[PDB]
């Protein structure tokens, strides 16, 4: 009944707009742009496909993606969904019925997929409509964890669900593989901010994994738990202050020598108009019994 009219589009212009480098953990994105002329024969229910590469997703830090409708003035020309291959299928409305000379433009942001692109390095991104494609080689740079003397830490936020008011934060503690004596981690709101995070025994769930080979760690902060050793039951998780958690890492010799992954599944306050603004602080001694801390801030604008 409906026809795939991809091949009948004309004047198809596809561009990937970015700089030389994309920094996913800075919430960097590329802009995907598509312009085309629609055939006069097009009717309601006709479709076309945008091919999106496996290196990209359309959701970014959010759990689900919503494809923007293609507009003709203040009317909807086409509605889009993401199929199971990650490609976008647009279906034309009755706007095209009894119209000629119809043209369209649509732009949407796209994000580097952390499961598909686990490491820093060049990737060639290709997108298209039919055999009309665009390609661009870009450096994907996840940059490095923070370090202060023998203390290292970094975290990233993903899986923000604004319907169910949830978020995920993945933290690497001691990714440098230093010796840290009497380590502790706290998770907090960033000072001098209206932050929408609810951190407490009800709202926060924490899993901890020991990393026996640091080469197994993704630079993208994609984590498959089965790759690591779940040690949740051997750490001590508490909530000593309002909107703060603490994790202690007791060991038989009072130090750690390996990285740990801390996976926080938390909640957002729907009453807040603030941003999701989190501070992770790692504490410990070095071998000269100097007590230090270092913090890592993650912030997602709402």
């Amino acid at each position, epitope marked *: 009944a409906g026809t795939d009219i991809t091949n009948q589009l004309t004047d198809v212009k596809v561009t990937i707009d970015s700089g030389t480098t994309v920094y996913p953990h800075q919430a960097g994105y590329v802009k995907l742009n598509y312009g085309f002329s629609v055939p006069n024969s097009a009717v309601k229910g006709d479709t076309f496909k945008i091919t999106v590469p496996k290196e990209l997703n359309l959701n970014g830090v959010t759990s689900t993606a919503k494809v923007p409708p293609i507009m003709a003035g203040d009317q909807v020309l086409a509605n889009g969904v993401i199929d199971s291959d990650g490609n976008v299928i647009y279906t034309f409305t009755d706007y095209v019925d009894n119209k000629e000379n119809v043209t369209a433009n649509i732009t949407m942001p796209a994000y580097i997929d952390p499961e598909n692109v686990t490491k820093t390095g060049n990737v060639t991104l290709t997108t298209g409509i039919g055999t009309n494609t665009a390609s661009k080689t870009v450096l994907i740079d996840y940059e490095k964890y923070g370090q202060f003397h023998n203390l290292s830490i970094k975290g990233t936020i993903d899986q923000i669900d604004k319907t169910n008011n949830t978020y995920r934060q993945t933290i690497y503690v001691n990714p440098s593989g230093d010796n840290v004596v009497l380590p502790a981690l706290t998770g907090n709101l960033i000072p001098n901010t209206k932050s929408n995070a609810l951190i407490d025994a009800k709202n926060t769930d924490i899993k901890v994994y020991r990393v026996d080979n640091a080469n197994d760690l993704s630079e993208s902060y994609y984590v498959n738990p089965s790759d690591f050793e779940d040690v949740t039951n051997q750490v001590r998780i508490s909530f000593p202050n309002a909107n703060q958690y603490k994790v202690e890492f007791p060991t038989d*010799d009072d130090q750690i020598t390996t990285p740990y992954i801390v996976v926080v599944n938390g909640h957002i306050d729907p009453a807040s108009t603030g941003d999701l603004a989190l501070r992770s602080t790692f504490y410990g001694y070095d071998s000269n019994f*100097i*007590w230090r801390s270092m913090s890592w801030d993650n912030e997602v604008a709402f």
Partner: antibody
Amino acid sequence: VQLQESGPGLVKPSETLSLTCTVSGGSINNSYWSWIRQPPGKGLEWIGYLYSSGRTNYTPSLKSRVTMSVDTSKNQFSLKLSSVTAADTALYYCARTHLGGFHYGGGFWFDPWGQGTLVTVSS
Amino acid sequence: DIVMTQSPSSLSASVGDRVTITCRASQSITSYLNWYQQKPGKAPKLLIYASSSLQSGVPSRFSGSGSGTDFTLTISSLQPEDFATFYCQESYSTPPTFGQGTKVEIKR
């Protein structure tokens, strides 16, 4: 918990001073321990620490002459100081070393101390 | 391993007098300052740790205060048995610096 130092009270110049600290009324395990010395009528000088697992840290000025070791089965740890001279004549103390950790926001202190044992370097 | 300056080198005070001993660090050491008492022919004994915490069993006439660079040991009412050399000790880093000591003599 009581600590007791033991070892020769007389050592010849250029040879090695050896002392042992015996822990009683408690266990040596899962703790840090230090050696600290005091020349007669002078102040205190920390020499180094050992954790019961065997890791150590020695004061930079003495590191090239110091060895500390532990035998947890005997509830004892030891100090060896090589290339001795009259400058090493002192009371030698062992002491349990506590770390303040998160609760105290850092720091460390020495408690309890042994009785001290005098070593004289002389020909 | 921070330079410390303990004052005074000695003092003489009567029983019941208030006595103050001070320690100055050359850079800030937060709360990382301990006090020891050394009686004649005895090892040092911990009196105060982490600036202000009193060791168990130590009389409450002994108090510690201060933060940053400047620390004070106070004896509110000097007693005969308090005769000793007192030492501060910073715990910012190993090797820890001990103060030069204060010899407390009792006037009678």
